[PDB]
């Protein structure tokens, strides 16, 4: 899949990659034991070969999802490819920037 930014602003795109705890889950979910996810833009290009990893239960889940994001400047096109383990984007965020601020952590 591909999206071309025609919104004259930067588009924040987010996705994930699923690392199951067992191979049974891998087969049941995606029907391949050799999985790849490719994300490509002119300023971001990364590839994923997620392998099984059984992990301690967090929220009662031995598996994980690694979360990833990037900015897509106008005119540029982002391309996803996968045979499994992809958590595709559904909504993205067309934003203009702003500059020089921070985050506050208080109960006021």
């Amino acid at each position, epitope marked *: 899949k591909s999206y071309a930014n025609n919104k004259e602003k930067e588009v924040l795109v987010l996705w994930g990659v699923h690392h199951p705890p*067992n191979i*049974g*889950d891998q*087969r*049941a*979910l995606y029907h391949t034991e050799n999985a790849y996810v490719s994300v490509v833009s002119s300023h971001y290009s990364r590839k994923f070969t997620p392998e099984i990893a059984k992990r301690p239960k967090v929220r009662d889940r031995e598996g994980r999802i690694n979360y990833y994001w990037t900015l897509l400047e106008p005119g540029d096109t982002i391309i996803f490819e996968a045979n499994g383990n992809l958590i595709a984007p559904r909504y993205a965020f067309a934003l203009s920037r702003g500059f020089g601020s921070g985050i506050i952590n208080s109960n006021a």
Partner: antibody
Amino acid sequence: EVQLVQSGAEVKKPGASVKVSCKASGYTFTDYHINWVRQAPGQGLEWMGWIHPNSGDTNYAQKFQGWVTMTRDTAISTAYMEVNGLKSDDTAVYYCARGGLEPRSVDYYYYGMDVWGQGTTVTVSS
Amino acid sequence: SVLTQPPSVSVAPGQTARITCGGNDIGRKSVHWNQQKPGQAPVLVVCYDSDRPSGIPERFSGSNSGNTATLTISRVEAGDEADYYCQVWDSSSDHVIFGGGTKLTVLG
């Protein structure tokens, strides 16, 4: 109405082989697994495996790895269970099942068994 | 792994028949239950711990939690005398496992 119709009873002597058939009707034969489960006389259910008609991907249980061969055809909406090197303790009833219980969560993402065949009685005696 | 299921259970009509399916972390695996009357093939009665396929009386249900699942038959009748089996899918070994089964004896 979903229905699985299996082949007829078989009487074999040790060492022979069998090929049991399971012909499906009432749904698109390619959407769901075909599981195979046997039940020996008086004892309980023992799962043998599944084959997905669309991909041909197979899942064999450990006890049945190598002795058994699961296949399909798709054109006639039929799945096959071939057993080799038969022995008196292989005497049992062989059921096929449809993996049509679509999973509700990706936590337990398992296609459970909806519909069953009537069984195929296989007797192995010397 | 293994699923512990009591060999026999005795119950009187009009009562509530309660049956156990033992196992490790079975509460996160969502059990299914099959009814087998003698001379017939198995039949699905309870799916997903508490639910039913079309055509099953509402008095068939169940619960699942911790290390114990349970099938619950309210308002027991005589036509319910049969062998009951619980089944789960172990993702570790990628197997479908059954319990030893239970003979429900209705004292009529």
